[PDB]
UniProtKB/Swiss-Prot annotation:
InterPro entries: Globin, Globin-like_sf, Myoglobin. Nitrite binds at residue 65. It comes from the Eukaryota. It is found in: Cytoplasm, Sarcoplasm. This is Myoglobin. The modification Phosphothreonine is found at residue 68. One of its GO terms (biological process) is removal of superoxide radicals. GO terms for cellular component: extracellular exosome; sarcoplasm.
Length: 154
């Protein structure tokens, strides 16, 4: 797939808002993922002991990991599709070391869209959401193709 420049502008316009508070957005997204799809929490040996949302909010570690996740995603979205290099190490660690199924990347995509819709209603109308969804679908498709080449079924 290929996004048009207008779709990338809608994605990077909302992302510039997210970047005003990377840690707050990373925390909301990862918690949203774990609350919605609790099975994803089992993949993190680091955080699986966390039992409640209050414990998740109070974990500095979790907040630090959310920042790492959004910084890496931000770096990929700012390439506007030319992200082949950035994707290689990410696909290798998530397919070989962590073993993350593509279905879980769909679940976090849903969590990113939920949180942006909830924090940025004015910059995340239907067209901007469609463009973000297209950008994350592109990301998932390119990662799934890499998973294949690496020998891991998504
Ligand atoms: C937007 C999609 C995601 C991005 C950009 C992302 C990014 C990262 C980055 C940059 C790291 C540290 C370096 C590395 O190990 O590769 C990492 C580690 C990790 N990721 Fe992801 N990730 C994503 C989705 C997921 C999902 C959906 C899961 C699980 C359901 C997951 C599980 C993990 C685990 C288990 C680690 C190691 C955590 C720790 O022990 O430090 N990732 N991720």
């Amino acid at each position: 797939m290929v996004l048009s420049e207008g779709e990338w502008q809608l994605v990077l316009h909302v992302w510039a808002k997210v970047e005003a508070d990377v840690a707050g957005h990373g925390q909301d997204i990862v918690i949203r993922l774990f609350k919605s799809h609790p099975e994803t929490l089992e993949k993190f040996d680091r955080f699986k002991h966390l039992k409640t949302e209050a414990e998740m909010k109070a974990s500095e570690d979790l907040k630090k990991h959310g920042v790492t996740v959004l910084t890496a995603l931000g770096a990929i979205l700012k390439k506007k599709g030319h992200h082949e290099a950035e994707l290689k190490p990410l696909a290798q660690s998530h397919a070989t070391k962590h073993k993350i199924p593509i279905k879980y990347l769909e679940f976090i995509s849903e969590a990113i869209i939920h949180v942006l819709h909830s924090r940025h209603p004015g910059n995340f109308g239907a067209d901007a959401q469609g463009a973000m969804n297209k950008a994350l679908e592109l990301f998932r498709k390119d990662i799934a193709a890499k998973y294949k080449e690496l020998g891991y079924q998504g």
